[PDB]
Amino acid sequence: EKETEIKNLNQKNSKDEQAITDQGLKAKSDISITKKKIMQQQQEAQDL
Amino acid sequence: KEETKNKNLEETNVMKIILETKQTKYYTELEQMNSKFQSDTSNKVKDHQF
Amino acid sequence: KTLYDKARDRFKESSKAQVAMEIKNEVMQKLKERLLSRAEIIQRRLEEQRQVLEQKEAQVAKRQEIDPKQEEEIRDINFKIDILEQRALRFESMALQKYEEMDNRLNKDARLAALHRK
Amino acid sequence: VKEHAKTEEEQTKNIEDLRIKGAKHYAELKITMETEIQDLEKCFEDMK
Amino acid sequence: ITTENIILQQLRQLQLSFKNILKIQHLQGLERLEKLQLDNNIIEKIENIDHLVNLKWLDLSFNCIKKIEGLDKLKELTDLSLFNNYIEKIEGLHNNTKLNVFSIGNNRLKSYEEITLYFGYKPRGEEGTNDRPEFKRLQVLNVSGNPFTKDKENEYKNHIICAIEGDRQLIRQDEQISNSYNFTTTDYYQQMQAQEQ
Amino acid sequence: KMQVLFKNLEKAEIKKMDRRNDYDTEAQKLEEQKSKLKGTMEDITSIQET
């Protein structure tokens, strides 16, 4: 029971750890809004 | 950190995009006339053996 | 706004239906995740205990002398396998129990009360 | 005081070797492709 | 604009590559030559340029040249190149200790220690009076293409750097050849500073 | 580990100066390209009068 609760809790530990880590890289969401404006400006420059 | 590596890797990418297509264009002629030879004289040589 | 002001104001402030379906489903899915994950943990432990038993029995067979210590460790591994299986069954039991319990508890929530309206 | 002093010093030093490595990467790949270009001629006149 | 009276003796930069020159002459009045370019030809001897002490950026490389000379009085030599030639020693440059930049590549050398001798570094077991570095400011150092430089690569880089361009620190990062020397480059800096003072 | 991974999200979301620096360079090139139209307009007008 000791080791089984340990395994359960540790698997929860890793699950939440990576479930948090993946979101942080999705700050590339704001980065991608910035790069959306990047592509808009790049398109507009060649227009003129 | 990423800013500094951005300039280095972007210079690398630009030089790549520019110069690599050079290597793409160069060689199209050498194979043409060589393969043309490899067929043309086959009959001459075969008669040269017969 | 001075730091003294900050401290004093901190002191003063210290002195001073459709959504419910989604909430229910979210709670049920997380509870099922927890209960299942524990179930596969117990199951995987069954497999690991069986693996240890198989290796120990193979070692005992290789050692023509049937080691009492090796057999004692083999029986320890067997008892571990059996107790892990018992916990796996019991855990399936109270895990379905927990799933039903949490669904029932979410169903009657006041903020989720709009659910029973349909 | 010392925290930020040595923080900025270390930050500048970090930017130093990063630029070293990246710039030499760029220059050496440029050299490689330049050699490719400079050797990508010939073999045609001799054969013909 | 080719000013008709471009003085025969107003020369600082000379470049006579691919003419296949063999000897140096008529340089009187060209002693003000600071940047000399005479590589990629049949030249084999360094002469009639030594009196051109103004020569800092000198290249006589990739030739039939076989020796380093005349630069003793061309101490002002800064960027010295004798690449792809038949030189087998760093000689006459003891009076070129001003040379920060040296290339002896694709020559017929056998060891790098000639350059490190210019830094107060000498091999163990040799009695020498050069306890003071010669190429104190020699940080540009290439020997690529030489017989030994093709021999078990990065050895000369490591030893020369520890006894002497971020490649220099990247090579000081070498652990074992670093142990092969004890007079570190920072110690070299402090010795230079104290000696200057 | 939960808090270590949680905190990384906020700074990444708030600060993206690497990509905004790429954006700044691209905007610099955009503005460099744009005014050439007005310059060519002026030259064209002068040449048209002549």
Q: How do strand E57-59 and strand E13-15 relate by DSSP bridges? A: unpaired
- How were these coordinates obtained? cryo-EM
Residues in chain D with CB shorter than 8 Å from the CB of E166 are: 17, 20-21, 24
E54 and E33 Cβ atoms separated by less than 8 Å: yes
Antiparallel, parallel or unpaired: β E101-103 and E13-15: unpaired
Q: Return the H-helix or E-strand segment holding E101.
A: strand E101-103
Which chain B residues are closer than 8 Å to D43 by Cβ? 27, 30
DSSP letter for each residue of A29-41 = HHHHHHHHHHHHH
Residue D18, SS3 per DSSP: helix
- B12, β-bridge pairs: none
From chain B, pick out residues whose CB is under 8 angstroms from the CB of F17: 3
Structure tokens that stand for E158 in this block: 């490591």
Contact B8 D43 (CB under 8 A): no
Distance from CA of A3 to the nearest CA of C (A): 10
Q: Which helix (H) or strand (E) holds E142?
A: strand E140-142
- Contact call for F8 and A21, based on CB within 8 A: yes
Please tell me the distance in Å from A7's CA to the nearest CA on chain F. Answer: 16
CA distance A15 to chain F (A): 10
Q: Which residues contact E123 (CB under 8 A, 6 or more apart)?
A: E113
Looking at the DSSP assignment, which residues form a beta bridge with residue E102? E80, E141
Please indicate if any CB of chain D lies within 8 Å of the CB of B32.
no
Instruction: Name chain C contacts of A11, Cβ cutoff 8 Å.
Output: 37, 41
| CA–CA distances in Å: residue C75 to residues A4, C70, E39 | 20, 9, 86
Q: At E149, give phi and psi (nearest 5°).
A: -65, -30
| Contact pairs from chain A to chain F, CB under 8 Å | 67
D21 lies within 8 A of chain E by CB = yes
